[PDB]
PDB file of all heavy atoms in Angstrom:
ATOM      1  N   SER M  10     -13.956 -41.938  60.718  1.00  6.03           N
ATOM      2  CA  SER M  10     -15.280 -41.447  60.372  1.00  6.03           C
ATOM      3  C   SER M  10     -16.332 -42.274  61.091  1.00  6.03           C
ATOM      4  O   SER M  10     -16.167 -43.481  61.286  1.00  6.03           O
ATOM      5  CB  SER M  10     -15.530 -41.502  58.862  1.00  6.03           C
ATOM      6  OG  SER M  10     -14.582 -40.733  58.145  1.00  6.03           O
ATOM      7  N   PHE M  11     -17.419 -41.613  61.472  1.00  4.87           N
ATOM      8  CA  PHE M  11     -18.575 -42.266  62.065  1.00  4.87           C
ATOM      9  C   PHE M  11     -19.813 -41.959  61.239  1.00  4.87           C
ATOM     10  O   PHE M  11     -19.964 -40.859  60.702  1.00  4.87           O
ATOM     11  CB  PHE M  11     -18.799 -41.813  63.508  1.00  4.87           C
ATOM     12  CG  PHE M  11     -17.942 -42.524  64.507  1.00  4.87           C
ATOM     13  CD1 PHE M  11     -16.691 -42.032  64.838  1.00  4.87           C
ATOM     14  CD2 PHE M  11     -18.391 -43.677  65.125  1.00  4.87           C
ATOM     15  CE1 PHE M  11     -15.900 -42.683  65.757  1.00  4.87           C
ATOM     16  CE2 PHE M  11     -17.606 -44.333  66.049  1.00  4.87           C
ATOM     17  CZ  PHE M  11     -16.360 -43.834  66.365  1.00  4.87           C
ATOM     18  N   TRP M 112     -40.993 -25.657  63.651  1.00 16.03           N
ATOM     19  CA  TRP M 112     -40.163 -24.528  64.047  1.00 16.03           C
ATOM     20  C   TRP M 112     -40.930 -23.230  64.247  1.00 16.03           C
ATOM     21  O   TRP M 112     -41.101 -22.784  65.384  1.00 16.03           O
ATOM     22  CB  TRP M 112     -39.051 -24.314  63.026  1.00 16.03           C
ATOM     23  CG  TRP M 112     -37.948 -25.312  63.137  1.00 16.03           C
ATOM     24  CD1 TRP M 112     -37.674 -26.338  62.286  1.00 16.03           C
ATOM     25  CD2 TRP M 112     -36.970 -25.379  64.178  1.00 16.03           C
ATOM     26  NE1 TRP M 112     -36.578 -27.035  62.729  1.00 16.03           N
ATOM     27  CE2 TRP M 112     -36.125 -26.462  63.887  1.00 16.03           C
ATOM     28  CE3 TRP M 112     -36.727 -24.623  65.328  1.00 16.03           C
ATOM     29  CZ2 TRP M 112     -35.052 -26.811  64.701  1.00 16.03           C
ATOM     30  CZ3 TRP M 112     -35.659 -24.966  66.136  1.00 16.03           C
ATOM     31  CH2 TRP M 112     -34.837 -26.054  65.820  1.00 16.03           C
ATOM     32  N   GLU M 191     -34.961 -23.160  50.062  1.00 33.46           N
ATOM     33  CA  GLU M 191     -33.849 -23.806  49.389  1.00 33.46           C
ATOM     34  C   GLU M 191     -32.654 -22.869  49.323  1.00 33.46           C
ATOM     35  O   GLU M 191     -32.731 -21.689  49.668  1.00 33.46           O
ATOM     36  CB  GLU M 191     -34.251 -24.249  47.978  1.00 33.46           C
ATOM     37  CG  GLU M 191     -34.918 -25.612  47.912  1.00 33.46           C
ATOM     38  CD  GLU M 191     -35.268 -26.020  46.492  1.00 33.46           C
ATOM     39  OE1 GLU M 191     -34.649 -25.479  45.553  1.00 33.46           O
ATOM     40  OE2 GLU M 191     -36.155 -26.881  46.314  1.00 33.46           O
ATOM     41  N   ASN M 215     -31.882 -31.291  63.352  1.00 29.18           N
ATOM     42  CA  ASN M 215     -31.441 -30.200  64.217  1.00 29.18           C
ATOM     43  C   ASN M 215     -32.378 -30.014  65.405  1.00 29.18           C
ATOM     44  O   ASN M 215     -31.932 -29.667  66.502  1.00 29.18           O
ATOM     45  CB  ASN M 215     -31.335 -28.908  63.408  1.00 29.18           C
ATOM     46  CG  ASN M 215     -30.398 -27.896  64.036  1.00 29.18           C
ATOM     47  OD1 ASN M 215     -30.619 -27.436  65.155  1.00 29.18           O
ATOM     48  ND2 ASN M 215     -29.343 -27.545  63.315  1.00 29.18           N
TER      49      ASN M 215
ATOM     50  P     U E  35     -20.336 -42.537  52.644  1.00  2.00           P
ATOM     51  OP1   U E  35     -20.912 -43.713  51.956  1.00  2.00           O
ATOM     52  OP2   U E  35     -20.910 -41.196  52.406  1.00  2.00           O
ATOM     53  O5'   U E  35     -20.355 -42.845  54.204  1.00  2.00           O
ATOM     54  C5'   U E  35     -20.968 -41.926  55.119  1.00  2.00           C
ATOM     55  C4'   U E  35     -20.006 -41.528  56.213  1.00  2.00           C
ATOM     56  O4'   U E  35     -18.673 -41.390  55.673  1.00  2.00           O
ATOM     57  C3'   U E  35     -20.315 -40.183  56.840  1.00  2.00           C
ATOM     58  O3'   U E  35     -21.267 -40.400  57.870  1.00  2.00           O
ATOM     59  C2'   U E  35     -18.956 -39.709  57.343  1.00  2.00           C
ATOM     60  O2'   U E  35     -18.652 -40.165  58.646  1.00  2.00           O
ATOM     61  C1'   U E  35     -17.998 -40.331  56.328  1.00  2.00           C
ATOM     62  N1    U E  35     -17.530 -39.391  55.303  1.00  2.00           N
ATOM     63  C2    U E  35     -16.168 -39.262  55.130  1.00  2.00           C
ATOM     64  O2    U E  35     -15.354 -39.864  55.807  1.00  2.00           O
ATOM     65  N3    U E  35     -15.794 -38.389  54.141  1.00  2.00           N
ATOM     66  C4    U E  35     -16.619 -37.659  53.317  1.00  2.00           C
ATOM     67  O4    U E  35     -16.126 -36.910  52.475  1.00  2.00           O
ATOM     68  C5    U E  35     -18.015 -37.861  53.547  1.00  2.00           C
ATOM     69  C6    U E  35     -18.412 -38.700  54.509  1.00  2.00           C
ATOM     70  P     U E  36     -22.731 -39.805  57.717  1.00  2.00           P
ATOM     71  OP1   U E  36     -23.714 -40.842  58.114  1.00  2.00           O
ATOM     72  OP2   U E  36     -22.837 -39.195  56.372  1.00  2.00           O
ATOM     73  O5'   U E  36     -22.750 -38.648  58.805  1.00  2.00           O
ATOM     74  C5'   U E  36     -23.587 -37.518  58.639  1.00  2.00           C
ATOM     75  C4'   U E  36     -22.894 -36.247  59.057  1.00  2.00           C
ATOM     76  O4'   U E  36     -21.527 -36.250  58.597  1.00  2.00           O
ATOM     77  C3'   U E  36     -23.483 -34.978  58.481  1.00  2.00           C
ATOM     78  O3'   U E  36     -24.577 -34.533  59.253  1.00  2.00           O
ATOM     79  C2'   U E  36     -22.306 -34.004  58.486  1.00  2.00           C
ATOM     80  O2'   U E  36     -22.194 -33.366  59.751  1.00  2.00           O
ATOM     81  C1'   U E  36     -21.109 -34.936  58.312  1.00  2.00           C
ATOM     82  N1    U E  36     -20.488 -34.928  56.971  1.00  2.00           N
ATOM     83  C2    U E  36     -19.255 -34.328  56.877  1.00  2.00           C
ATOM     84  O2    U E  36     -18.718 -33.783  57.825  1.00  2.00           O
ATOM     85  N3    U E  36     -18.666 -34.371  55.644  1.00  2.00           N
ATOM     86  C4    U E  36     -19.181 -34.962  54.509  1.00  2.00           C
ATOM     87  O4    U E  36     -18.543 -34.929  53.459  1.00  2.00           O
ATOM     88  C5    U E  36     -20.455 -35.581  54.689  1.00  2.00           C
ATOM     89  C6    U E  36     -21.046 -35.552  55.884  1.00  2.00           C
ATOM     90  P     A E  37     -26.069 -34.758  58.779  1.00  2.00           P
ATOM     91  OP1   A E  37     -26.689 -35.755  59.675  1.00  2.00           O
ATOM     92  OP2   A E  37     -26.070 -34.980  57.313  1.00  2.00           O
ATOM     93  O5'   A E  37     -26.728 -33.343  59.094  1.00  2.00           O
ATOM     94  C5'   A E  37     -26.310 -32.594  60.249  1.00  2.00           C
ATOM     95  C4'   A E  37     -25.761 -31.246  59.847  1.00  2.00           C
ATOM     96  O4'   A E  37     -24.657 -31.422  58.915  1.00  2.00           O
ATOM     97  C3'   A E  37     -26.748 -30.307  59.153  1.00  2.00           C
ATOM     98  O3'   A E  37     -26.536 -28.965  59.574  1.00  2.00           O
ATOM     99  C2'   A E  37     -26.338 -30.415  57.692  1.00  2.00           C
ATOM    100  O2'   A E  37     -26.701 -29.289  56.919  1.00  2.00           O
ATOM    101  C1'   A E  37     -24.826 -30.538  57.834  1.00  2.00           C
ATOM    102  N9    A E  37     -24.154 -31.090  56.661  1.00  2.00           N
ATOM    103  C8    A E  37     -24.690 -31.875  55.673  1.00  2.00           C
ATOM    104  N7    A E  37     -23.839 -32.191  54.727  1.00  2.00           N
ATOM    105  C5    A E  37     -22.666 -31.557  55.112  1.00  2.00           C
ATOM    106  C6    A E  37     -21.389 -31.500  54.530  1.00  2.00           C
ATOM    107  N6    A E  37     -21.065 -32.114  53.391  1.00  2.00           N
ATOM    108  N1    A E  37     -20.441 -30.781  55.169  1.00  2.00           N
ATOM    109  C2    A E  37     -20.765 -30.170  56.314  1.00  2.00           C
ATOM    110  N3    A E  37     -21.927 -30.149  56.959  1.00  2.00           N
ATOM    111  C4    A E  37     -22.847 -30.871  56.298  1.00  2.00           C
ATOM    112  P     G E  38     -27.280 -28.386  60.862  1.00  2.00           P
ATOM    113  OP1   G E  38     -26.309 -28.345  61.976  1.00  2.00           O
ATOM    114  OP2   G E  38     -28.554 -29.117  61.030  1.00  2.00           O
ATOM    115  O5'   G E  38     -27.591 -26.885  60.441  1.00  2.00           O
ATOM    116  C5'   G E  38     -27.863 -26.548  59.070  1.00  2.00           C
ATOM    117  C4'   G E  38     -29.295 -26.884  58.729  1.00  2.00           C
ATOM    118  O4'   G E  38     -30.060 -27.011  59.955  1.00  2.00           O
ATOM    119  C3'   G E  38     -30.012 -25.857  57.861  1.00  2.00           C
ATOM    120  O3'   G E  38     -30.013 -26.388  56.542  1.00  2.00           O
ATOM    121  C2'   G E  38     -31.410 -25.782  58.467  1.00  2.00           C
ATOM    122  O2'   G E  38     -32.313 -26.726  57.929  1.00  2.00           O
ATOM    123  C1'   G E  38     -31.148 -26.117  59.934  1.00  2.00           C
ATOM    124  N9    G E  38     -30.804 -24.969  60.764  1.00  2.00           N
ATOM    125  C8    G E  38     -29.590 -24.332  60.841  1.00  2.00           C
ATOM    126  N7    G E  38     -29.581 -23.345  61.694  1.00  2.00           N
ATOM    127  C5    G E  38     -30.867 -23.328  62.214  1.00  2.00           C
ATOM    128  C6    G E  38     -31.458 -22.471  63.176  1.00  2.00           C
ATOM    129  O6    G E  38     -30.945 -21.526  63.786  1.00  2.00           O
ATOM    130  N1    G E  38     -32.786 -22.810  63.414  1.00  2.00           N
ATOM    131  C2    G E  38     -33.461 -23.836  62.804  1.00  2.00           C
ATOM    132  N2    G E  38     -34.740 -24.002  63.168  1.00  2.00           N
ATOM    133  N3    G E  38     -32.923 -24.640  61.900  1.00  2.00           N
ATOM    134  C4    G E  38     -31.633 -24.330  61.656  1.00  2.00           C
ATOM    135  P     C E  39     -30.916 -25.741  55.405  1.00  2.00           P
ATOM    136  OP1   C E  39     -32.253 -26.367  55.472  1.00  2.00           O
ATOM    137  OP2   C E  39     -30.153 -25.781  54.137  1.00  2.00           O
ATOM    138  O5'   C E  39     -31.031 -24.222  55.864  1.00  2.00           O
ATOM    139  C5'   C E  39     -30.224 -23.195  55.258  1.00  2.00           C
ATOM    140  C4'   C E  39     -30.963 -21.882  55.316  1.00  2.00           C
ATOM    141  O4'   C E  39     -30.186 -20.846  54.658  1.00  2.00           O
ATOM    142  C3'   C E  39     -32.323 -21.887  54.635  1.00  2.00           C
ATOM    143  O3'   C E  39     -33.240 -21.137  55.418  1.00  2.00           O
ATOM    144  C2'   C E  39     -32.045 -21.183  53.314  1.00  2.00           C
ATOM    145  O2'   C E  39     -33.210 -20.576  52.803  1.00  2.00           O
ATOM    146  C1'   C E  39     -31.010 -20.151  53.750  1.00  2.00           C
ATOM    147  N1    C E  39     -30.150 -19.588  52.696  1.00  2.00           N
ATOM    148  C2    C E  39     -30.703 -19.228  51.463  1.00  2.00           C
ATOM    149  O2    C E  39     -31.910 -19.422  51.265  1.00  2.00           O
ATOM    150  N3    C E  39     -29.907 -18.682  50.516  1.00  2.00           N
ATOM    151  C4    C E  39     -28.614 -18.477  50.770  1.00  2.00           C
ATOM    152  N4    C E  39     -27.864 -17.943  49.804  1.00  2.00           N
ATOM    153  C5    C E  39     -28.028 -18.817  52.024  1.00  2.00           C
ATOM    154  C6    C E  39     -28.828 -19.356  52.952  1.00  2.00           C
TER     155        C E  39
END
Side-chain angles (χ1 to χ4, degrees):
Chain M
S10 301
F11 278 89
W112 284 108
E191 274 181 22
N215 203 299

